[model samples]
Target: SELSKSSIVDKVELDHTTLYQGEMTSIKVSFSDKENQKKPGDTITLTLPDALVGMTENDSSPRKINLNGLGEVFIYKDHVVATFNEKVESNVNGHFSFGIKTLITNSSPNVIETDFGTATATQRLTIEGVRDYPFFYKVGDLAGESNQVRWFLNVNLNKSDVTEDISIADRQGSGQQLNKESFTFDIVNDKETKYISLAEFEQQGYGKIDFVTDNDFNLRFYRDKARFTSFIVRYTSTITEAGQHQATFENSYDINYQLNNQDATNEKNTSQVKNVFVEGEA
Candidate 1:
């Protein structure tokens, strides 16, 4: 039988690995059965990653591949079947890839680990949008009677290459109250030498700012529509207590975005703020 050959999986490929949430993606798995020895009850099953969702295959095709769950797709065929899926989502923040195969029988419902023979090859892919530390942050001096500290958040994105809904949140570190009134959000198109003010960006639905807490704030922006080469967020905080106090702060960002037209879910990235201490006046 062709199935007895060392190689069961000949080739596996995806049309797009990077996509946004609810967008269609394709996977093509090819096989060779030169003797045409497959039977009606035989099946070739593919266990997809759980992050995949809303799977469907072509009803009008030569052979059919169908979804068993959000996590698995099966193809029943004689010699071969080539199929694609309607959509998938990457629900986490890091490298997302597909792992290989396992086999099971109805009598033995437990999944049994299987190995590809020497001739068989496992195909793998990685999708990444989540950031380790996407933005760079810089803290300014504690220079005032209240010891005000300023911080800058910068993100560089290409308007034509990426579409994103960006959210930035800042948490107040120890010994400080965030100054909401001092926050500034703006965009600059370096290529065009033009700037979009926060006021104008709000009017155009390109930016929105909200205070989640007295110590925390959030900013939203439309990356594709913003038509900018870079985005900037600046804010100030006041130190209430003194005496070598550590002005620790936290920063996080979430991107609901698409890369190269592949829809992806909200991918989050967070970072610990480096400790910045204030010196007591002599």
Candidate 2:
């Protein structure tokens, strides 16, 4: 009786049309024209049961609302849904009813394609921490050992220049911290992880938290080091776990003599060691 005509908040406009997983988004809707606007003593009531059905809608107080992943927000009498995909043409009505709604888990690599309205606009989103280390390295000798001090890295999706806010966080502490103790991640894509130096990587827009140090390594006499000529480093790191990194070393040197009882008159020429092999996890 008292709530016959709802408040004249005729339309709802969202501040951000795009959303990333594990992110909070707020939408506000208010009255539009004077004809639909609320007067001093007009009673107004709102209904959102049909707006969000398949997905979860967080209802706090009364007027305020929060969406977990998706929603068909209704404000000022207008409604919109956070849809990953639309079956407009497929449904013949060019509209998706809340009952027959398809819910998408708000997770990383979330892709939504909705073919509604006049022109269809699909939104693509990805959750943060999808990959432990977007990039890793195994160079020189540290490679192929699951329990050796290796490189490791974590990333936040916000760090990317993308409109979506994603970031990477190496719980191991980023940078040389990744190569500490045991092997965490390996060097890949390039010979020495392109840029072992974090400064160089940051210039490329790759925000690395830290690199691992404290690797378990063994060494022989500097004389014998000359014998292992040809080296290859390997890298193995996991995105979800921490502290588990592996790296191996390789060298290409010709240790012709071991300076034990060498000839008195001998000429020594310095040579660079190359051709080292190594491998690790992804």
Candidate 3:
């Protein structure tokens, strides 16, 4: 029904330019002619930004928007095309009016700006995506008269998906010995902590610990699944020949598991304190 083509004056109603992951802004398009002129098949086009997309009607439908005095209009990809029908006769006003959506992806810019026959507008978008860490290892100091030093081996900090088995192995240097009686772990979330013992950890079918604590050791979680939480390993190692002063000591460890069905390994030889050894006044 190609009868008339008019230079329609379009006005976008943002009013709320604050955009996020999921939001739709109102818009309008109308005939600019004062003679109430527009044929039964007149059409107007509104081009949108690259990142912005048209909100759809459904899984198999398009964004078909209908106005009281205007004809049938729809969002066709990057453009909004409106066609007049029997409802064409006055300065038809379409106040969707209609809407455009945010299609966020790697190429989508943080700010979206566009113009539709009027002053251009912009909107800011925010996103919160996936997060993870490599590994966390720390070596604590031993007070003047203390014979032991503190050690922490934290793994599964992200608690992401896992399969098969989760393995953790540690090694120490200098001249400090790992006490066979000094191994503990705590499972923690954002605000809660639950301490687990080596024996209970096995009795409950958690995992197995090989206490070659003198210089190195290994822990495996083949009996249970690595679920959702951080496992913090804490223990104390005593300096040999207590009652004398030892130079310093250091510790290192590694963790391995399947994240997203892919192999992942995290290893750290020294903590943020670096090579600073423990002042063991044994």
TM-score for each predicted model, relative to the true structure: 0.40, 0.21, 0.44
Ranking by lDDT: 3, 1, 2
State the weakest 10-residue window (summed lDDT) of model 3: 273-282
Candidate 1 at residue 146, lDDT? 31
Q: Score candidate 3 by lDDT.
A: 0.56
Which of 1 and 2 is ahead in lDDT?
Answer: 1
Error of 2 at 221 (Å): 30
Residue 177, candidate 3: alpha-carbon lDDT: 72
- True lDDT of residue 214, candidate 2: 36
lDDT of each: 0.43, 0.25, 0.56
Backbone clash count, each prediction separately: 8, 81, 2
Candidate 1 residue 17 Cα shift, in angstroms, is 49
The C-alpha local distance difference test score for the whole of candidate 1 amounts to 0.43
User: How far out, in Å, is residue 245 in model 2?
Assistant: 42
Clashing pairs in 1: 19-262, 19-263, 19-264, 20-262, 20-263, 20-264, 21-263, 21-264
Residue range 1-282, candidate 2, lDDT tens digits: 111133333333233445433233232333322333322223223333222212222231111122222212222222333221211211110112111111224444444333222111222322232333211122221121122223322211112112221222222221123233232221233223332343433354433323322322321112222122211222333221232222222211111122224432222222121211111100
Native-structure RMSD, model 3 = 24.1
